[PDB]
Curated annotation (Swiss-Prot):
This is Complement C3d fragment. Disulfide bonds join 108-165. Changing residue 167 to A: Minor effect on binding of C3d to CR2. The lineage of its organism: Eukaryota, Metazoa, Chordata, Craniata, Vertebrata. It comes from the Eukaryota. It comes from Homo sapiens.
Length: 294
């Protein structure tokens, strides 16, 4: 439970286009989410929350300016829509539903577009127009195991928006099962701890991380406390956060403490260049820990 005093830098005013606006919206949404769940508003300064909610609304409203007729999103209205960005918008908006008024049409419109336009017959989600801001995609920037990493990423967004979009988007359940099929079928082949963690989470969300796959997920953890790859530490923080969420989904509370301890000791408080995924993920994971861990 990172103390509120350390998170002041996360109350960010969003500005910029389709990607930049989201880079700015991210810390504010997750900071409010985290402060709410850990009940730290009094030790943060309750008089700071209303402005934070306004900044979040500011981010949402600004983002809508880049919502294309297809309900997809891109950095600029004339740029081909990005599968990743659209899925990220869904990821953030779904989590901010209780913070501000998110128009279901917008949310579910994006979900629908991803399913009907970017999912292959084998369940794979494909990206036809990569984001300009490659630093905002975290561990996905490493081109290794892209099909798995991206499908897991998009699948996680769809699952978070399932309840809200189920009736409005009938092809949702099928989409989720297909992507899950793809992940399950190739899970034993993954070499990256990042992919093992992100896909492990997507699978656990469906209750499909079992037996050998579950065993691979657990044993991939170095010293039973983190999921890491020989690269940027930021990617490892993000991977370990996805892994923690998977553990909570699995309700494997025995394995959890070492992981949260490692995450805490990183003393990472988000923010900074290329911090979008690590910031959203670490605070989503820790807030979820507060909510679910006995």
């Amino acid at each position: 439970m990172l103390d509120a005093e350390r998170l002041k830098h996360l109350i960010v005013t969003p500005s910029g286009a389709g990607e930049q606006n989201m880079i700015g919206m991210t810390p504010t949404v997750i900071a409010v989410h985290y402060l709410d769940e850990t009940e730290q508003w009094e030790k943060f300064g309750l008089e700071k929350r209303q402005g934070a909610l306004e900044l979040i609304k500011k981010g949402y409203t600004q983002q809508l300016a880049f919502r294309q007729p297809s309900s997809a999103f891109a950095a600029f209205v004339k740029r081909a829509p990005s599968t990743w960005l659209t899925a990220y918008v869904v990821k953030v908006f779904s989590l901010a539903v209780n913070l501000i008024a998110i128009d279901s049409q917008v949310l579910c419109g994006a979900v629908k577009w991803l399913i009907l336009e970017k999912q292959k017959p084998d369940g794979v989600f494909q990206e036809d127009a990569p984001v300009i801001h490659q630093e905002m995609i975290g561990g996905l920037r490493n081109n290794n195991e892209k099909d798995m990493a991206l499908t897991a990423f998009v699948l996680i967004s769809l699952q978070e928006a399932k309840d809200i979009c189920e009736e409005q988007v009938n092809s949702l359940p099928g989409s989720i099962t297909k992507a899950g099929d793809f992940l399950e079928a190739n899970y034993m082949n993954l070499q990256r701890s990042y992919t093992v963690a992100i896909a492990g989470y997507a699978l656990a969300q469906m209750g499909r991380l079992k037996g050998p796959l579950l065993n691979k997920f657990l044993t991939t953890a170095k010293d039973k406390n983190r999921w890491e790859d020989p690269g940027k530490q930021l990617y490892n923080v993000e991977a370990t956060s996805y892994a923690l969420l998977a553990l909570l989904q699995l309700k494997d509370f025995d394995f959890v403490p070492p992981v949260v301890r490692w995450l805490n000791e990183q003393r990472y408080y988000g923010g900074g260049y290329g911090s979008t995924q690590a910031t959203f993920m670490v605070f989503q994971a820790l807030a979820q820990y507060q909510k679910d861990a006995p």
